Design a protein around this ligand. Structure first.
Ligand SMILES: Nc1nc2c(ncn2[C@@H]2O[C@H](COP(=O)(O)OP(=O)(O)O)[C@@H](O)[C@H]2O)c(=O)[nH]1
Ligand SMILES: Nc1nc2c(ncn2[C@@H]2O[C@H](COP(=O)(O)OP(=O)(O)O)[C@@H](O)[C@H]2O)c(=O)[nH]1
Lengths: 370, 386, 308, 369
């Protein structure tokens, strides 16, 4: 099973290039796409070595980078231009798809804040939902006329993408000023690429469980609507300390309430016998709450750090608080709707995002069913 | 070779040799006889020190040849990756290729066909970068229904290495492999259903009268995948990764090949005990099987409700695309809405019986100690127990 | 007594006859004096007896403060529930999490704390909770089930007094944004926080300070077995644990008064006054009639109050 | 339970900056916020290590100090500008609140003598609105000056659940008497000694006093009489220390009786002669208390930091603190006869008079009713 990734817009292209840099460094692959001498399953993201990427001005910057051997601002303009070159890009996508043995998904890295990447990703998501009906679509979308584009992207993402991971530049900048003392794109992108590389750790280093994307998705997302996740990365030592530092709101990349599903990935050489004690004590001290209707638990898995490159850890959560962010956008849209062919698509977008926020707000009730 | 061919003689042990010292020689001799034939490699108080000196050197060398070339040690590690599903990457691809075959009844199944499939998987996954010797013994065997009831791997071992396994470790591994195979297909079913729903709602999201009953199909899934996706962790961390650690710790320090046999023999008495395959825990496993069955009945009562909505959707597509009569279909559309509450009474009675077999399952765990760590995995956040 | 010391260490990790000369009697002592020095040191540095008694004191005598203020804060809602209603798999998960998050993390022997719900009260849910400590063989000669339940008898008597003035001090903020109860809360808070001070720094502490020094001059195990039970029978004597049941009923009006104030009447606050003040005067009447048991009065009243 | 501290004005910054420096050294923590190898509970004030502080042109003096990697004059100007940034500084406090496990208090360090007076008056009002269950202790420092001083006292008598007075006048004497200075850079060294030794029982866990509400409810009997003064002798048995704390020469204050006394002994003194001294203090009658309610004296021991000898601090609730108010009350009326409603000052004037009457009523055998 092979995962193909797509990079749209300046932000998406930059974060994808840095992610590929990080992943090539994790393995023994020189910038010249030649394996270095110096166990790690690398077939998923690399083709025998060339990455499975589809880039769509900064391309010249990448071509001038040492890694050359490795390959308007409106939403409506982006959508129109994406409709204009449907066949041109889809020939590339189809040749790269059918060239693969068994395709699995379509990772999409783009910024929904604005520009052409937003509308282009909208159009691509629609067309991929049209053509390929059996391919999971995960999206590493990055959160920031901007409210218009953002809400349109949310409208297209709440029904097409079978999963989604949010990344807000505000929280990243906050963490940068707090514990990195920057005052830049090229600095927050480091942490972004770190989180991304650590996200797909269990796919490249095989373990007891989590050998496929469905193993990561179907565990967290219980219903097809609640498919927005948040990330946490504590190392910026026992597993209990890691789990206690992870659940702190100081580290989560997010600006009653309870949890739906939690997943922990530990990349250290820790003793794997103390994890059950860690979970026992976490349940004892009652540091986190769960849904009252269905039985929801926390899952933990281990892995191995890249030997060619200490204890680290990442956390993927399904928290109902994320809806708050949408509200802000929603709010701004209303503020933008009363200040200034049919202009009805934006109204439908507002309607469906209101539906989604209502569903999130109803999810935290003991009678969420019906 | 390990399980058989080397049995201690209780009658001819000299009195000046304690009963424990007699199991460090039978383990040191077997460690060298198995290092030659199967692994395919060739090289008082001072008396007690000689046994331990030959133990902490031969066994420590058996692992090195069993980790670099695949060599008594390089077989133990390689017999966990495949025969105990410790690879994950290889067993994943192997369950996708045997799917079109095992669905047929066993009568049409012949061993000579499956070997080409197994050989294909070892070439595709990461198991290709592996010692050629240990790959020569990895084969298939057919137990004597359906193809998912008679398939199993064997990994036959003969020669000097056969004095460590002794025909009993090969009769316990297959006793374990059945439980790890069932708990592996009961998961790839529940990630297929959870995959269907992500492509289901992308088609029939325009029928607001069907989401009322489609919803009960999602909650029952996310309540069922938890019980399985949690039991997988208890299998990994509290059965495999924990009971294997007490084996690799009593091997790099053991010697005389008789502290290796006794360390590998008890390694098969805890896994049989930590898993529910014991003799006195019979009431627990037969109780678990019922939960394994309810996962299949959902997968049968789902596509029936799934396909019945795609037919009515497909007819509704053609009933308006060719024309853009009106009264003869409203009775067909009208009756279709009337069949919905019938299907709702299925998922309302299937769920109410699924919860009645899990809340009964937990009561049986309070019986023999490591099982308590399972009750916490399932009952996290106290979704049950009111 | 020589070889037995050699066995509780082994499993874990020339003599001639003469008459009128004791060349063997002295020889036995030169080995027994080493047979002990290897075991005693085995218990103080690795798996730290004197470095083993201190760990028990931290939880049983509640010496460690950071562990209780964080444990009762987590396991309070799950203790007010009645008996035969709480799952021990729920408490122990909180106990493990209470130790690691606290500052008791630097304790090699912390993994021997077990929850033990007693059937009888201190002759439910909250009044039926007490730690249990399991020890290995060679140390089980000193601290055994006969002389560990005593550690468990003077523990609940200190977990009760720590619980009341934990919530009595909790109502202190609720009322602070009908106005004559503040001078009554002063009458109970200055009673428990004047018993706890006498119970911690002038009763058990002094006895413990003696035991530590009294174990440096030990000579044989049947003496250490005397300096220990000689320490537990003193703590149970200087405290009110040995009768003086008026303290038990005296505590009821304190904890119940916290419930009345928690229901947010004017004829009930004054009702507690005449009831509690009368119960207190019964105490100092019996605490004074004796042959310290007399210095406790100087701790209860300091301003000459209660001179009636 | 964690305590997030606040620092307002040039005073609050300087005392807090020197309070942290006293704490960072008392633990094995380098000024680079890195633990040095070289048992002490350090989670209350530090977050795993970063101090939980929310400061508010002296800030630049801290950013140039080696500790950079560790993080007008009208009362109306302080209260006005504080309303303009209502959402700004509450964003920080809120994001620092939920990130903590379970908030316990708000130790606020400010001087009532420019902007720290008006801003602190704004905060103590706004905290009681949103956070109704959080204690708010304040280490206020006593010095148009009569106006800004008393106006803060209106808020500090109904909002702050505790208050520790530290007047610069009595400190300046001890600066002159036993230190012979004639400077702010010196008197703050004594203030930092009082602030650090105040929370020595929270950072070093003992038998009792493992939470801030344990030190508060013992001394303060009623919500109004919530003003405390300090005493610190080392500038030898427990009797030597206890006798020196009760001398008026040591108190940081320029009939009358005590209400509650808490003694902090940071020495290695054996805990056996602790009751003998208390027995002796009762005999010689070195201090008197209230006649109406049962008032007792409490003593607490602790352990000095090995990384840094007997010391001693005393938390006192003395009625003679009413004298400091009268000095403020007096000079106000003089400025009231010398020169949109000017009603807040008169309304504040009334409530301070209610407080002083409550003190002088506390020394009466019929203080009840
Ligand atoms: N987090 C992050 N966001 C970025 C970065 N570069 C650009 N962005 C976002 O991308 C948006 C601009 O997109 P733009 O390049 O104009 O899209 P285009 O018009 O299609 O080229 C801004 O709102 C940024 O928030 C980056 O390096 N990191
Ligand atoms: N004890 C002490 N008090 C100080 C110190 N620095 C300033 N103060 C007090 O703070 C008052 C001046 O406050 P100010 O700095 O003008 O407040 P601002 O207007 O907010 O800057 C003076 O009356 C001093 O009593 C110090 O280092 N120590």
């Amino acid at each position: 099973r092979e995962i193909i990734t797509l990079q749209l817009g300046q932000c998406g292209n930059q974060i994808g290039f840095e992610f590929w840099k990080q992943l090539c460094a994790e393995h023994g692959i020189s910038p010249e796409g030649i394996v270095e001498e110096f166990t790690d399953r690398k077939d998923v993201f690399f083709y025998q070595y060339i990455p499975r990427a589809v880039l769509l001005r900064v391309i010249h910057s990448i071509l001038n980078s040492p890694y050359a051997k490795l390959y308007g601002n409106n939403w409506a303009s982006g959508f129109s231009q994406g409709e204009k070159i449907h066949e041109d890009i889809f020939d590339i996508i189809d040749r790269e798809a059918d060239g693969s043995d068994s395709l699995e998904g379509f990772v999409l890295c783009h910024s929904i804040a604005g520009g052409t990447g937003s509308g282009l990703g909208s159009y691509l998501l629609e067309r991929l939902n049209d053509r390929y009906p059996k391919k999971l679509v995960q999206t590493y979308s990055v959160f920031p006329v901007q409210p218009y584009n953002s809400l349109l992207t949310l409208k297209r993402l709440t029904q097409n993408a079978d999963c989604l991971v949010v990344l807000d530049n505000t929280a990243l900048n906050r963490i940068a000023t707090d514990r990195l003392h920057i005052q830049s794109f090229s600095q927050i992108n480091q942490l972004v690429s770190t989180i991304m590389s650590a996200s797909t750790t269990t796919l490249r280093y095989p373990g007891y469980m989590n050998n496929d994307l469905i193993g990561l998705i179907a565990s967290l997302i219980p219903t097809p609507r609640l498919h927005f996740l948040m990330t946490g990365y504590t190392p910026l030592t026992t597993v209990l300390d890691v789990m206690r530092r992870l659940l702190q709101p100081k580290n989560v990349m997010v600006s009653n309430h309870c949890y739906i599903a939690i997943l922990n990935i530990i990349q250290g050489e820790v003793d794997p016998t103390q994890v059950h004690k860690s979970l026992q004590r976490i349940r004892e001290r009652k540091l986190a709450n769960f849904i009252p209707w269905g039985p929801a638990s926390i899952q933990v898995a281990l892995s191995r750090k890249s030997p060619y490159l200490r204890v680290s850890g990442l956390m993927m959560a399904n928290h109902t608080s994320i809806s708050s962010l949408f509200e802000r956008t929603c709010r701004q849209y209303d503020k933008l709707r009363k200040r200034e062919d049919n202009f009805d698509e934006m109204d439908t977008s507002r309607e469906i995002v209101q539906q989604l926020i209502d569903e999130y707000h109803a999810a935290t009730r003991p009678d969420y069913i019906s | 070779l390990w399980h058989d061919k080397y049995t201690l003689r209780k009658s001819m042990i000299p009195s000046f040799m304690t009963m424990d010292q007699s199991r460090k020689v039978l383990l040191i001799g077997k460690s060298i006889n198995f290092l030659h034939q199967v692994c395919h490699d060739q090289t008082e108080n001072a008396f007690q020190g000689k046994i331990d000196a030959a133990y902490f050197e031969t066994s420590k060398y058996l692992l090195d040849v069993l980790n670099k070339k695949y060599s008594l040690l390089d077989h133990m590690q390689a017999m966990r990756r495949y025969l105990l599903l410790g690879q994950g990457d290889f067993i994943r691809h192997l369950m996708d290729l045997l799917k079109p075959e095992l669905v047929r009844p066993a009568t049409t199944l012949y061993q000579h066909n499956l070997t080409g499939i197994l050989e294909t998987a070892v070439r595709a996954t990461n198991a290709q970068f592996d010692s050629p010797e240990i790959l020569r013994r990895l084969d298939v065997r057919l137990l004597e229904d359906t193809g998912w009831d008679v398939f199993s791997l064997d990994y036959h071992v003969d020669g000097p290495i056969a004095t460590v396994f002794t025909r009993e470790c090969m009769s316990h591994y297959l006793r374990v492999f059945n439980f790890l195979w069932r708990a592996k297909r009961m998961e790839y079913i529940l990630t297929d259903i959870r995959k269907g729903h992500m492509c289901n709602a992308k088609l029939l999201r325009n029928m607001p009268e069907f989401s009322g009953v489609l919803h009960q199909c999602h909650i029952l899934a996310s309540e069922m995948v938890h019980f399985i996706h949690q039991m997988q962790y208890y299998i990994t961390f509290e059965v495999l990764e924990c009971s294997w650690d007490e084996l690799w710790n009593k091997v790099q320090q053991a010697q005389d090949l008789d502290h290796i046999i006794a360390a590998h023999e008890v390694f098969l008495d805890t896994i049989i005990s930590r898993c529910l395959l014991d003799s006195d825990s019979r009431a627990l496993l037969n109780q678990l099987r019922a939960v394994f069955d309810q996962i299949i009945e959902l997968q049968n009562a789902q596509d029936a409700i799934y396909r019945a909505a795609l037919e009515e959707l497909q007819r509704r597509l053609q009933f308006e695309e060719k024309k853009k009569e009106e009264e003869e279909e409203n009775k067909r559309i009208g009756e279709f809405k009337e069949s919905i509450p019938k299907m709702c009474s299925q998922l309302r009675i299937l769920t109410h019986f699924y919860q009645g077999i899990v809340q009964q399952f937990l009561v049986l765990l309070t019986t023999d100690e490591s099982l308590r760590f399972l009750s916490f995995r399932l009952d996290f956040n106290e979704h049950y127990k009111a | 007594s020589t070889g037995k010391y050699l066995n509780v260490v082994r499993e874990c990790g020339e003599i001639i006859y003469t008459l009128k000369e004791r060349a063997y009697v002295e020889q036995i002592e030169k080995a027994f004096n080493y047979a002990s020095k290897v075991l005693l040191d085995f218990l103080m540095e690795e798996k730290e007896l004197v470095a083993h008694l201190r760990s028990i004191k931290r939880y049983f005598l509640m010496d460690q403060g950071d562990f209780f203020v964080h444990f009762m804060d987590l396991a309070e809602e799950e203790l007010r529930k009645p008996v035969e209603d709480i799952t021990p798999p729920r408490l122990e998960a909180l106990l493990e999490l209470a130790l690691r998050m606290s500052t008791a993390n630097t304790d090699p022997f912390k993994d021997d704390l077990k929850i033990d719900l007693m059937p009888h009260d201190l002759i439910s849910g909250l009044e039926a909770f007490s730690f249990d400590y399991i020890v290995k063989w060679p140390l089980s000669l000193i601290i055994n089930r006969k002389a560990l339940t005593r550690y468990q008898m003077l523990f609940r008597h200190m977990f009760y007094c720590k619980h009341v003035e934990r919530q009595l001090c909790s109502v202190w903020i609720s009322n602070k944004t009908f106005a004559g109860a503040f001078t009554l809360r002063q009458r109970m808070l200055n009673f428990v926080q004047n018993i706890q001070y006498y119970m911690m720094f002038e009763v058990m502490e002094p006895t413990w300070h003696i035991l530590e020094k009294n174990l440096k001059s030990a000579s044989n195990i049947d003496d250490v077995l005397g300096h220990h039970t000689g320490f537990l029978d003193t703590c149970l004597k200087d405290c009110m644990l040995t009768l003086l049941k008026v303290f038990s009923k005296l505590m009821s009006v304190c904890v119940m008064f916290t419930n009345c104030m928690q229901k947010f009447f004017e004829a009930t606050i004054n009702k507690f006054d005449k009831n509690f003040s009368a119960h207190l005067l019964d105490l100092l009447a019996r605490l004074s009639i004796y042959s310290g048991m007399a210095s406790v009065i100087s701790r209860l009243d300091f301003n000459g109050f209660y001179t009636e």
